[PDB]
Amino acid sequence: PGKSPDSPQWRQHQQDVRNLNQYQTRGAFAYISDQQKVYARFFWQQTGQDRYRLLLTNPDGSTELELNAQPGNVQLVDNKGQRYTADDAEEMIGKLTGMPIPLNSLRQWILGLPGDATDYKLDDQYRLSEITYSQNGKNWKVVYGGYDTKTQPAMPANMELTDGGQRIKLKMDNWIVK
Numbered sequence: 739p740g741k742s743p744d745s746p747q748w749r750q751h752q753q754d755v756r757n758l759n760q761y762q763t764r765g766a767f768a769y770i771s772d773q774q775k776v777y778a779r780f781f782w783q784q785t786g787q788d789r790y791r792l793l794l795t796n797p798d799g800s801t802e803l804e805l806n807a808q809p810g811n812v813q814l815v816d817n818k819g820q821r822y823t824a825d826d827a828e829e830m831i832g833k834l835t836g837m838p839i840p841l842n843s844l845r846q847w848i849l850g851l852p853g854d855a856t857d858y859k860l861d862d863q864y865r866l867s868e869i870t871y872s873q874n875g876k877n878w879k880v881v882y883g884g885y886d887t888k889t890q891p892a893m894p895a896n897m898e899l900t901d902g903g904q905r906i907k908l909k910m911d912n913w914i915v916k
Contacts, residue, residue: 739862740859740860740861740862740867741860741861741862741863741864742860743858743859743860745860745864747864748860748864751850751864751865751891752851752852754890754891755849755850755851755891755893756851758891758915758916759785759916760783760784760785760914760915760916761782761783761784761849761893761913761914761915762781762782762783762784762913762914762915763781763782763848763893763910763911763912763913763914764779764780764781764782764910764911764912765779765780765908765909765910765911765912766779766780766907766908766909766911767779767780767794767906767907767908768905768906768907768908769837769904769905769906770904770905770906771836771837771838771903771904771905772903773836774836774837776794776802776837778794778795778796778802778803779794779795779796779797780792780793780794780795780908781793781795782848784845784849786808788807788808788809789807789808789809790806790807790845791804791805791806791807792804792805792806792807793805800817801815801817802817803815803816803817803835804816805827805830805831807827810825811823811825812824812825812826812827812830814830814831814834814835816835822834826842827841827842827845828840828841828842837904838904839904839906840871840873840874840878843855843871843873844899844906847866847869847880847894847897847899848894848897848908849893849894850865850866850882850885850891850892850893850894851866852866852869853871854871855869855870855871855880857869857870857871858870861882863885863892865882865885865892866882866894867881867882868880868881868882869899876901876902877901878899878900878901879899879900879901880897880898880899881897881898881899882894882896882897883895883896883897883898884896886910886912886913888912888913889913889914889915890915891915893910893913893915894908894910895909895910896908896909896910
């Protein structure tokens with residue numbers, strides 16, 4: 739049955755997450771679509787409200803992709819060192835890598851926050867459990883597995899999101915927050 743979104747504990751959990759100044763996680767990344775299959779280790783570091791770096795690496799240790807976002811300056815770097823710049827991370831990853839994603843929202847979802855989503859459920863611990871979000875004529879479903887309760891506040895330990903044609907799976911080995 740989970741818990742009600744109107745619960746003070748939910749609002750407090752969101753506040754505790756938003757009050758953090760830095761977030762860092764790493765783990766297994768899986769992206770699958772009818773035109774691509776990407777498996778890699780990921781590293782996510784967010785040092786500002788809208789400042790973050792996503793790094794995807796292969797077993798070789800080689801860099802598959804780098805997405806470094808700063809307000810007014812998002813840079814995408816591919817394995818060949820080719821650099822591209824834009825003012826929107828979602829638009830760039832959507833038309834540059836072949837991996838379209840509601841990234842502007844995912845950046846909040848990965849922290850256990852709903853972002854612009856208004857259709858969601860919470861688990862028994864007042865933490866985000868499922869999200870239904872529409873954009874670009876598609877409907878995304880986000881599902882959360884267990885949370886990492888070794889940090890304060892607790893952060894998502896695993897999640898999956900899909901809109902049918904695209905599926906992204908993330909498994910976090912750990913988190914560091916401050």
